[PDB]
CSV table of C-alpha atoms in Angstrom, one decimal:
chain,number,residue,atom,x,y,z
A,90,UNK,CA,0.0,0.0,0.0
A,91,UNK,CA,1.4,3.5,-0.3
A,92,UNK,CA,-0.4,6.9,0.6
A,93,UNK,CA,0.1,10.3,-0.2
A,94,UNK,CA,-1.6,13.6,1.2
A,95,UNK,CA,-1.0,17.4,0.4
A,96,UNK,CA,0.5,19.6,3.6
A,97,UNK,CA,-0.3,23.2,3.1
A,98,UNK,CA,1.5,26.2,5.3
A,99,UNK,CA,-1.7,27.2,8.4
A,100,UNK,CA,0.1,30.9,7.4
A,101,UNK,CA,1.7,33.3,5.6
A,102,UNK,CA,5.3,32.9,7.4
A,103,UNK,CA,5.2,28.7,6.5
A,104,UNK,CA,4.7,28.7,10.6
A,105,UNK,CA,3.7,25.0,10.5
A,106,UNK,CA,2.4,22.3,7.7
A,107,UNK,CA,-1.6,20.7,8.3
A,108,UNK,CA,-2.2,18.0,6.2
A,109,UNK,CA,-5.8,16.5,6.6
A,110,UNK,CA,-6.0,13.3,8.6
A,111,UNK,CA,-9.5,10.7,8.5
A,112,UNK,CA,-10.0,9.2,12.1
A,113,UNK,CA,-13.1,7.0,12.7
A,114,UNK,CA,-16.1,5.7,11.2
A,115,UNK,CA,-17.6,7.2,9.3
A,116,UNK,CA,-14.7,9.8,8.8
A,117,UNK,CA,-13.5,12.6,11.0
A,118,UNK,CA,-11.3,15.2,9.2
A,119,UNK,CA,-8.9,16.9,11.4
A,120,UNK,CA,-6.0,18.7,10.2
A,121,UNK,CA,-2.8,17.7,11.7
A,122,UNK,CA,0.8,19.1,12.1
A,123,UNK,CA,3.2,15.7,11.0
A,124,UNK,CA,5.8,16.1,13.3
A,125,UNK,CA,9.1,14.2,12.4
A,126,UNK,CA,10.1,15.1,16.3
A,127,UNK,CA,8.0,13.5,18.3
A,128,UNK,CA,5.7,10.4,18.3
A,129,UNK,CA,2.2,11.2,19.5
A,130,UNK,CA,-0.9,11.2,17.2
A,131,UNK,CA,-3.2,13.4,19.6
A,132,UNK,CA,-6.2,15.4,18.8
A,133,UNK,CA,-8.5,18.0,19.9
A,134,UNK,CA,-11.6,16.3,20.9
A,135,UNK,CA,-15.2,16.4,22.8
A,136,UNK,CA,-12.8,15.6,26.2
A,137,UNK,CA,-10.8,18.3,25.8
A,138,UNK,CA,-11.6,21.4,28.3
A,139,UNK,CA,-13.9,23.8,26.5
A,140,UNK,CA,-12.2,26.7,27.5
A,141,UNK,CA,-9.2,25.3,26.0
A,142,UNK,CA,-10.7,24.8,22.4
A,143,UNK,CA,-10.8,28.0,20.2
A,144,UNK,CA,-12.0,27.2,16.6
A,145,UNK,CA,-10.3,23.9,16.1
A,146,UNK,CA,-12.0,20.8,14.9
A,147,UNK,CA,-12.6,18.4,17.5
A,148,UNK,CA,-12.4,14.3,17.2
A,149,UNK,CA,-15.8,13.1,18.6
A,150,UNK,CA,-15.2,9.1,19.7
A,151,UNK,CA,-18.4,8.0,20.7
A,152,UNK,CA,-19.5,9.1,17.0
A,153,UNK,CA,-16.7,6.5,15.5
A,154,UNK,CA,-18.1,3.1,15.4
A,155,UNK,CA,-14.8,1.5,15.5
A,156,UNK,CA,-13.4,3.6,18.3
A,157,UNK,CA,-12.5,2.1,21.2
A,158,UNK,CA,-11.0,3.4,24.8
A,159,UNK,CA,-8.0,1.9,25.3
A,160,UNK,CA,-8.5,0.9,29.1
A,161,UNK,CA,-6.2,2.7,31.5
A,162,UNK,CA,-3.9,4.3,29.4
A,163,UNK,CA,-2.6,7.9,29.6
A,164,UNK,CA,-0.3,10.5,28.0
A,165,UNK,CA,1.2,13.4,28.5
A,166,UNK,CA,4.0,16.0,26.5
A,167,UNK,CA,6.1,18.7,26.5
A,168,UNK,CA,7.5,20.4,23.4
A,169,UNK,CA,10.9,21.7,22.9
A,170,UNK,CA,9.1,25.4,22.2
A,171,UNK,CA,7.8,24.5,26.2
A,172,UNK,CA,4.2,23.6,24.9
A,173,UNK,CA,1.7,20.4,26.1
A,174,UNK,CA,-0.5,18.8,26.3
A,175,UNK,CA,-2.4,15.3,27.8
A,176,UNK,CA,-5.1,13.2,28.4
A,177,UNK,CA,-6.2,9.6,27.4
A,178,UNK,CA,-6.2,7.2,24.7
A,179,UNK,CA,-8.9,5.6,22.0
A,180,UNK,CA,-8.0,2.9,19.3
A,181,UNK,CA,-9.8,4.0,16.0
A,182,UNK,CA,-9.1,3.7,12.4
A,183,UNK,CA,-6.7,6.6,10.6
A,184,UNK,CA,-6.4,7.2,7.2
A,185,UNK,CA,-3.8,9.5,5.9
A,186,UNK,CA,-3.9,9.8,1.6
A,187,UNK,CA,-5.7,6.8,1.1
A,188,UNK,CA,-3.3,4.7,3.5
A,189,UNK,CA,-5.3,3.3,6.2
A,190,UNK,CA,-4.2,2.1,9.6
A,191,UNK,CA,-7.0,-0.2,11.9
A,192,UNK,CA,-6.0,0.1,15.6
A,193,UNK,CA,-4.3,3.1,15.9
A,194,UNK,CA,-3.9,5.2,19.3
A,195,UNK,CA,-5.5,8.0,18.8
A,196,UNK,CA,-4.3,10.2,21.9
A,197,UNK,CA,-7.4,12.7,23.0
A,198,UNK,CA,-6.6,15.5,24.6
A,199,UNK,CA,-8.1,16.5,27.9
A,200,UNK,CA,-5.5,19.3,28.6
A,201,UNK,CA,-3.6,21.7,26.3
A,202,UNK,CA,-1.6,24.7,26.4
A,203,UNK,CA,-2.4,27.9,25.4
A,204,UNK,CA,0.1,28.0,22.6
A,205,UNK,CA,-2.3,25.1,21.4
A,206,UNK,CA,-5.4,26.8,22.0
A,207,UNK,CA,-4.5,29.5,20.3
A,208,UNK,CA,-3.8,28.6,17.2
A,209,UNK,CA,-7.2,27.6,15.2
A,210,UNK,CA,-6.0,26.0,12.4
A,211,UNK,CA,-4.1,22.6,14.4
A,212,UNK,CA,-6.4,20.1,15.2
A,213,UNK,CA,-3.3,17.8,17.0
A,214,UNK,CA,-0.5,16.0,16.0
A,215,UNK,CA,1.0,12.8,14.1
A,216,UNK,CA,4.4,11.9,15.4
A,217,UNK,CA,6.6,10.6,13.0
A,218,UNK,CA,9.5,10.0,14.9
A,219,UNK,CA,10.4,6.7,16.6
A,220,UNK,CA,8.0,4.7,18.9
A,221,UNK,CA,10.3,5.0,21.9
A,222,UNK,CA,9.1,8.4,22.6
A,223,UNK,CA,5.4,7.7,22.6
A,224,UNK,CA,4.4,8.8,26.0
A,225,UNK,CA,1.1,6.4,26.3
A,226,UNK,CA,1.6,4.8,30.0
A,227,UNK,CA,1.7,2.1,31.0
A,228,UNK,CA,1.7,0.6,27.1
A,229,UNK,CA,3.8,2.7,24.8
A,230,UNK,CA,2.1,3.0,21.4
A,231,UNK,CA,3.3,3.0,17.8
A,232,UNK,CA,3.1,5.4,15.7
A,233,UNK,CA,0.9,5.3,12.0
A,234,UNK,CA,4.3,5.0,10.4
A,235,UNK,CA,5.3,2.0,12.5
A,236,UNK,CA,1.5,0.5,12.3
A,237,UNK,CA,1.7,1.0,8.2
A,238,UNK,CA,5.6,0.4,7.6
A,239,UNK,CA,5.0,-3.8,7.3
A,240,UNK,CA,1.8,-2.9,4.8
A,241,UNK,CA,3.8,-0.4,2.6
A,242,UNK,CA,5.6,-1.1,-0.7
A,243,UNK,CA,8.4,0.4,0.7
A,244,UNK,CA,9.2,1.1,4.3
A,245,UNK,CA,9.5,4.6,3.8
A,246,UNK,CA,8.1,8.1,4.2
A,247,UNK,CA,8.8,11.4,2.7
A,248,UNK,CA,8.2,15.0,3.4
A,249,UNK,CA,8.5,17.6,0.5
A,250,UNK,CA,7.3,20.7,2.1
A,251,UNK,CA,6.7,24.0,0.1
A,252,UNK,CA,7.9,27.4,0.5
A,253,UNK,CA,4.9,29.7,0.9
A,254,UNK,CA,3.0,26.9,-1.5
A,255,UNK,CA,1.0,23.3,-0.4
A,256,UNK,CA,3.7,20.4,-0.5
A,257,UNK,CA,3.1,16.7,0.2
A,258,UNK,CA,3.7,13.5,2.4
A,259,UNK,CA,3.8,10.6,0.5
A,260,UNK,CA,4.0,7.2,2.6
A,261,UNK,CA,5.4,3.8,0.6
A,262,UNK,CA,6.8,5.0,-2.4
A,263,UNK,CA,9.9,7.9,-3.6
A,264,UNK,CA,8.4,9.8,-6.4
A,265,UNK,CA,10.9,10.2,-8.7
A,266,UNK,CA,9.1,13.3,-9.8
A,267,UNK,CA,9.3,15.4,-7.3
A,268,UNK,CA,13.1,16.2,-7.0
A,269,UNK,CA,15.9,16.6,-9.2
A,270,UNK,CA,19.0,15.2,-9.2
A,271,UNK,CA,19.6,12.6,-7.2
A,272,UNK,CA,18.8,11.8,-3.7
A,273,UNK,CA,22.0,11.3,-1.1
A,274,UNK,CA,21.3,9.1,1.6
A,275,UNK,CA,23.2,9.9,5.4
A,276,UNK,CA,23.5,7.6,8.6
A,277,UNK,CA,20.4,8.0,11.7
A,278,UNK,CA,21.2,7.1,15.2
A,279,UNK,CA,18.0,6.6,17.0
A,280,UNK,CA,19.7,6.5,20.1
A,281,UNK,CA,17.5,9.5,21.2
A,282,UNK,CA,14.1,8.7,19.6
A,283,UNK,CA,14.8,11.1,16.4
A,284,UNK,CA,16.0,11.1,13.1
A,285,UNK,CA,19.2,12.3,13.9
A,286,UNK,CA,22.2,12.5,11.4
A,287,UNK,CA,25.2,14.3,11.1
A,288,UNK,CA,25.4,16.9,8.3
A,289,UNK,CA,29.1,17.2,6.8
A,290,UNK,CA,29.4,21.3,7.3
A,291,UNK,CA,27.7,24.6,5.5
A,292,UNK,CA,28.8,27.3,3.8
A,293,UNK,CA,26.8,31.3,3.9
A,294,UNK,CA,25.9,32.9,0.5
A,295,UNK,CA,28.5,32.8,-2.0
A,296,UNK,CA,31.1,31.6,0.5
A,297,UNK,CA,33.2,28.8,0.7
A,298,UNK,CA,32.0,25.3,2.5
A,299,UNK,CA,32.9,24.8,5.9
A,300,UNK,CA,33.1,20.8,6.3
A,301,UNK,CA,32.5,20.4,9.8
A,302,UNK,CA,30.3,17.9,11.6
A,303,UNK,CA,26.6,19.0,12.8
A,304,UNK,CA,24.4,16.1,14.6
A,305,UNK,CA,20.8,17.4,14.6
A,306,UNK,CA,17.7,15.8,14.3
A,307,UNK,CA,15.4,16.4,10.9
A,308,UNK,CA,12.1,17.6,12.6
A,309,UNK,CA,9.0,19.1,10.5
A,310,UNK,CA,7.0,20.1,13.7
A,311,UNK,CA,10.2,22.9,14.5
A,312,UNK,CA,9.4,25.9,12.2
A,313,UNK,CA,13.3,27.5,12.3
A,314,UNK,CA,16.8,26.1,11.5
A,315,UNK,CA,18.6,25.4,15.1
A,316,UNK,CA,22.5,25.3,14.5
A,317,UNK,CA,25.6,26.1,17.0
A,318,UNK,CA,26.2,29.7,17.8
A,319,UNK,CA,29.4,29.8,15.8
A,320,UNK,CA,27.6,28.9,12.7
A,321,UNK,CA,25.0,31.2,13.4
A,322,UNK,CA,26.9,34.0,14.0
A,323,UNK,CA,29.0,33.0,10.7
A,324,UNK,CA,25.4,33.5,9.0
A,325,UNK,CA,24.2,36.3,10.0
A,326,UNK,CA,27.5,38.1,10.5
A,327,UNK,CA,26.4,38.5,6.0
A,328,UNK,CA,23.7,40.7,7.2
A,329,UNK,CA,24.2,44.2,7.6
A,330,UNK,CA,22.4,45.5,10.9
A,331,UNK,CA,21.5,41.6,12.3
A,332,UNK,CA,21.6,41.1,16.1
A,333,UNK,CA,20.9,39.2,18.3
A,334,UNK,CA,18.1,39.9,20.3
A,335,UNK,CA,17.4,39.0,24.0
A,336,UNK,CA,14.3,40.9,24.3
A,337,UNK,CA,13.2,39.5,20.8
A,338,UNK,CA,15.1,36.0,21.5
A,339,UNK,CA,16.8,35.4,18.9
A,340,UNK,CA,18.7,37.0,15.9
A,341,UNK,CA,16.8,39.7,14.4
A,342,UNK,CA,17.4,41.7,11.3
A,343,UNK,CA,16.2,45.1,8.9
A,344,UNK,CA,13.2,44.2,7.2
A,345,UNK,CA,14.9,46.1,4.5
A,346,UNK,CA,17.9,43.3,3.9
A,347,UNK,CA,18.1,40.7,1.2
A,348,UNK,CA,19.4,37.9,3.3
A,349,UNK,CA,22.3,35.2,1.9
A,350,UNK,CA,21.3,31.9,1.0
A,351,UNK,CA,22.9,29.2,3.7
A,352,UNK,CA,23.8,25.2,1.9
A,353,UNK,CA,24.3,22.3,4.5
A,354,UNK,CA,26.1,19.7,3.4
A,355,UNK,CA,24.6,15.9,3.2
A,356,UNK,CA,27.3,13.8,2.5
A,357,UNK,CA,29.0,15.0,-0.3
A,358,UNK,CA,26.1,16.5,-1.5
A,359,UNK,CA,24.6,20.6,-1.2
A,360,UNK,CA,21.2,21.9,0.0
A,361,UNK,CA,21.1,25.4,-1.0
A,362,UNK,CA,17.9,27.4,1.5
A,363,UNK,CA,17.8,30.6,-0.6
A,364,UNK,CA,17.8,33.4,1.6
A,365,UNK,CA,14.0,34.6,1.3
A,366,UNK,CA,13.2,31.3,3.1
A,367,UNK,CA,15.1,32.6,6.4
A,368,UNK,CA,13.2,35.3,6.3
A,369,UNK,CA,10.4,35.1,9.2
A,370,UNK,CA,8.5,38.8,8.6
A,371,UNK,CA,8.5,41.7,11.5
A,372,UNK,CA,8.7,40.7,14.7
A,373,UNK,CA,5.7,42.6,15.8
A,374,UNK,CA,3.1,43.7,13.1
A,375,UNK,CA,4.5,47.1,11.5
A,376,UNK,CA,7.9,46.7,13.1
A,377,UNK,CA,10.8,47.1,10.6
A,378,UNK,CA,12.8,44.3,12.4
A,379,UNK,CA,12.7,41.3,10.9
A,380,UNK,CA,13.3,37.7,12.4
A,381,UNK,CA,15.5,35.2,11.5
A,382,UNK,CA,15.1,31.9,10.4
A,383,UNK,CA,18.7,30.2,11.5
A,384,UNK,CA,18.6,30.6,15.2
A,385,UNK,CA,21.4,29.3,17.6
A,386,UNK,CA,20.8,25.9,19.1
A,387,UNK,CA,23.0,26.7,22.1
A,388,UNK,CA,21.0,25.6,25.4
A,389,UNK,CA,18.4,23.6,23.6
A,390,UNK,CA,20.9,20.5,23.9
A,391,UNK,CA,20.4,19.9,20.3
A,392,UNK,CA,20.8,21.0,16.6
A,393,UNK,CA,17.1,21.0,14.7
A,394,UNK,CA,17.2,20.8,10.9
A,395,UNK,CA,13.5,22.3,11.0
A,396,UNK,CA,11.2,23.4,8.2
A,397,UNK,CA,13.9,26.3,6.9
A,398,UNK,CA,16.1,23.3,6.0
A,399,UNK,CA,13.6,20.8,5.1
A,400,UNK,CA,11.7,22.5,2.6
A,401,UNK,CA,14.6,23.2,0.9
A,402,UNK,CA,14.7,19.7,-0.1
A,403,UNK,CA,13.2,16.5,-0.7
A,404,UNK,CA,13.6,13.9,2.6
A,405,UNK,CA,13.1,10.4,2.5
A,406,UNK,CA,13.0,8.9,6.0
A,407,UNK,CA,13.5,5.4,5.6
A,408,UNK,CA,12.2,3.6,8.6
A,409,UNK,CA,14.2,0.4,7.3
A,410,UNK,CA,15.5,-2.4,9.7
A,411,UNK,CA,18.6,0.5,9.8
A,412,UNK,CA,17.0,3.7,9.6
A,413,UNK,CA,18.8,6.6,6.9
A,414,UNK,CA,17.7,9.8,6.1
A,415,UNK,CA,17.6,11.1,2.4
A,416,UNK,CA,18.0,14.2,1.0
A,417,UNK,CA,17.4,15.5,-2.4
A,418,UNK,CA,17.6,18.9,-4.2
A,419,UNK,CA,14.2,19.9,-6.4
């Protein structure tokens, strides 16, 4: 089986990616965020506190026939942007492009944050990243990827997110179509529950490559590029008038620059992130400070090759017996 579903920016700044998501029977359409960084599939839903839901779409179990409560089992998480969220657990069917998982955990939130809340346009999550960081107690679940990997063509997914356009996840199949060149593949630990690899080094604008080794994880739920502070600095160094901000957090820059393209290196291979793509729009509406898209990683305890980097390419994450990642220019 494959399946393949469009992802389309919930804004103007590529914040975050919902692709729409069928849960139950008949079908409940909630858009989700696919997040490559964590391993939850959780939803908004009729148990979630009212107060707490703002203009999302809800999942509604006792109108799925095939939904079930998973007896005794909870969750809870915390994002890396200090987010949550937590509740209990339902088995249902999922369908994501035509691919269709029976028995899924289908985490329904009780409790969320307000970053959550807020935002209208996320109706929950579908971790991607590996089981071992589900956070269902006292039985860990999979996630869809692990549940559909043995029913796939191929045991693969890939994410070919747009810049300021729709893209697509396609589950079970590469399509050969939708990059150019050709696609160079990179070791993953999973020793942390991501798909981590080491990128060989980067280079700013026009400038030469730096080979240097940068572990990070490949994560479409971060919206930014997380790198160290010496290759930040490096980046936007290029910029005339860029800071960095403490009252902002984070680098910051005149609305009125053209920024430099930055290229990580995949192997022996190039991923060029033109510079428009770093650029994240005023910091507060009518400001002419602009914020950055590379941001330092220093005391996050990791590098994050987030959306910035990942729409620049085409990523196969190949949940084979030994994981890879793959990257591809198009």
């Amino acid at each position: 089986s494959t399946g393949s579903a469009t992802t389309t920016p919930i804004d103007s700044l590529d914040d975050a990616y919902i692709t729409p998501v069928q849960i139950g029977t008949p079908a409940q359409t909630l858009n989700l965020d696919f997040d490559t960084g964590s391993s939850d599939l959780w939803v908004f839903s009729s148990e979630t506190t009212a107060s707490e839901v703002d203009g999302q779409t809800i999942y509604t179990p006792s109108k799925s026939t095939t939904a079930k409560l998973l007896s005794g089992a909870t969750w809870s998480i915390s994002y890396g942007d200090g987010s949550s969220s937590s509740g209990d657990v339902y088995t249902d069917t999922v369908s994501v492009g035509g691919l269709t998982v029976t028995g899924q955990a289908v985490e329904s939130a009780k409790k969320v944050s307000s970053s959550f809340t807020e935002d209208s346009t996320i109706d929950g999550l579908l971790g991607l990243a590996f089981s071992t960081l589900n956070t269902v107690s006292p039985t860990q679940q999979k996630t869809f990827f692990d549940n559909a990997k043995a029913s796939l063509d191929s045991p693969v997914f890939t994410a070919d997110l747009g810049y300021h356009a729709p893209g697509t996840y396609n589950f079970g199949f590469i399509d050969t179509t939708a990059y150019t060149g050709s696609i160079t593949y990179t070791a993953v630990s999973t020793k942390q529950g991501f798909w981590e690899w080491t990128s060989t080094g980067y280079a700013v604008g026009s400038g030469t490559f730096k080979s240097t080794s940068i572990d990070g994880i490949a994560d479409t739920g971060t919206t930014l590029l997380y790198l160290p502070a010496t290759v930040v600095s490096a980046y936007w160094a290029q910029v005339s008038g860029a800071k960095s901000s403490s009252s902002v957090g984070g680098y910051v820059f005149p609305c009125s620059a053209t920024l430099p393209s930055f290229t990580f290196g995949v192997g022996s291979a190039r991923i060029v992130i033109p510079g428009d793509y770093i650029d994240f729009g005023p910091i507060s509406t009518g400001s002419s400070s602009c914020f950055g898209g590379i941001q330092s990683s220093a005391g996050i305890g990791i590098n994050i090759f987030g959306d910035v980097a990942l729409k620049a390419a085409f990523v196969v994450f190949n949940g084979a017996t030994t994981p890879t990642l793959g990257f591809a220019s198009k």
